[PDB]
Design a protein around this ligand. Structure first.
Ligand SMILES: *SC[C@H](NC(=O)CC[C@H](N)C(=O)O)C(=O)NCC(=O)O
Ligand SMILES: *SC[C@H](NC(=O)CC[C@H](N)C(=O)O)C(=O)NCC(=O)O
Ligand SMILES: O=C1C[C@H](c2ccc(O)cc2)Oc2cc(O)cc(O)c21
Ligand SMILES: O=C1C[C@H](c2ccc(O)cc2)Oc2cc(O)cc(O)c21
Lengths: 235, 235
């Protein structure tokens, strides 16, 4: 494939999706990363890379240029789920996208559930807007899609990529009691989520497997995430 | 491919996405259609086909069975965008999915814009919730993605599939003054949208092309849609 510049941020779970994808493709050392400070975005980012002014975004092909001076000739692509599929499409030996058409749809249907149920339900619960049961209900929906063993469609796929950055950050929010509920309520919810027992037994094992995946650990600055998350709550 | 049963409804734009896709694949006469009455859903639909109780849904493979008695052995798939990609994946000679990885991402990015901007903005405006300018702004976003000529990425693709059912129904809503604004306001907005002139000139030509596409006309019961839409407004 042509040269890739990835515009990312350690803080952003949507961006880690693309970092995980590149790492699964064992291409993480072939691409140039540039970190965007989301509180102080470069003035060139929105007009030259992504008018939505969000990470991730990729500059694909074109001449060799400094990453803070992206070329007009590179192809600009945004949206983490789309970029994950682009990475699968560019590096087929990654096996991110299953060959079988049925298995692809099931991976993409799981992503739909990550997108329309888990993430919004996590957002609402971690901010104190909704109930614990609303969050657990959304997780049980995903659990019900899981096969008896393995990842979302057996073999690791884009489905697991979509979920993992939000799972690992939720773990941090809950382990450290940053979810807006009294002390110990956070850690109790983590155990429900990841113990491997109880109503979310199967999801708990799956969660253990997602967070052990090499690609996740290598692209997850837990110390940086945990430090930022405590400061945010402190306000 | 194995046998396909498609659970659909003339009224539903999300379902027409799959009908358009099948027709582009020149496979519309190979699949069994079953019409779901969304006001009186069969009792077997949710437990045996799609627990979300929505159309479209596909039963894939399995034995030959009556469509109102779907087999446990067929693979059940739901979500119109995912089913459109499944159809592209099953019938590659349809050319619904471009070969080039960059062109696929651009088609899918357009769909993201159809999904996150056009459809929600149309929904809000057609019900009287938001402003005309909010709707036109969302359309101009899509316009800005269009190439100088052709469909969303040049060649017809899944991108155009995603949009067309909502465009053709919006046309009906607006032509017939069913949008909640005084008489003539509907028809004025249609001309803005489809004239090929003005601020939405390029989109207007594109709209002309989407609504002339054979696949759209063959899967669009305009008389049935127009009759239902007038009755709805009449309440
Ligand atoms: S997490 C950082 C933000 N990213 C996104 O919101 C990406 C979401 C996209 N829809 C996607 O790609 O999935 C970000 O960059 N936000 C900018 C900001 O600071 O508001
Ligand atoms: S238009 C008919 C309804 N379909 C959908 O809502 C499908 C949306 C999906 N998210 C998709 O596939 O894109 C439907 O069947 N509604 C059931 C009802 O009557 O409420
Ligand atoms: O069709 C979809 C929609 C789904 C999605 C659903 C809701 C949402 O808010 C965001 C994404 O994401 C996807 C991700 C993919 O890799 C491939 C797909 O075909 C889809
Ligand atoms: O990644 C996405 C998300 C996009 C989408 C975005 C927002 C939304 O609400 C629904 C869908 O739909 C898709 C449709 C596809 O064919 C392939 C894709 O990769 C995607």
């Amino acid at each position: 494939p042509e040269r890739i510049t990835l515009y990312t941020a350690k803080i952003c779970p949507f961006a880690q999706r693309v970092e995980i994808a590149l790492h699964e493709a064992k291409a993480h050392h072939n691409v140039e990363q540039f970190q965007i400070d989301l509180q102080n975005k470069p003035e060139w980012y929105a007009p030259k890379v992504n008018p939505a002014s969000k990470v991730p975004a990729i500059a694909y092909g074109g001449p060799h240029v400094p990453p803070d001076q992206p070329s007009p000739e590179s192809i600009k692509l945004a949206e983490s789920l789309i970029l994950v599929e682009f990475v699968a499409d560019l590096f087929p030996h990654s096996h991110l996208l299953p060959h079988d058409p049925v298995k692809r749809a099931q991976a993409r249907f799981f992503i739909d559930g990550v997108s329309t149920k888990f993430i919004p339900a996590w957002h609402a619960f971690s901010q104190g807007k909704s109930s614990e049961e609303d969050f657990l209900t959304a997780v049980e929906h995903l659990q019900a899609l899981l096969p008896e063993s393995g990842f979302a469609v057996g073999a690791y796929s884009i489905a697991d990529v979509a979920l993992t950055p939000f799972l690992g950050r939720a773990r941090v929010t809950l382990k450290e009691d940053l979810g807006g509920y009294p002390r110990g309520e956070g850690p109790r919810v983590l155990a429900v989520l990841t113990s491997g027992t109880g109503r979310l037994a199967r999801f708990g094992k799956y969660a253990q497997d997602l967070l052990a995946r090499e690609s996740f650990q290598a692209t997850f600055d837990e110390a940086y995430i945990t430090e930022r998350y405590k400061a945010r709550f402190a306000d």
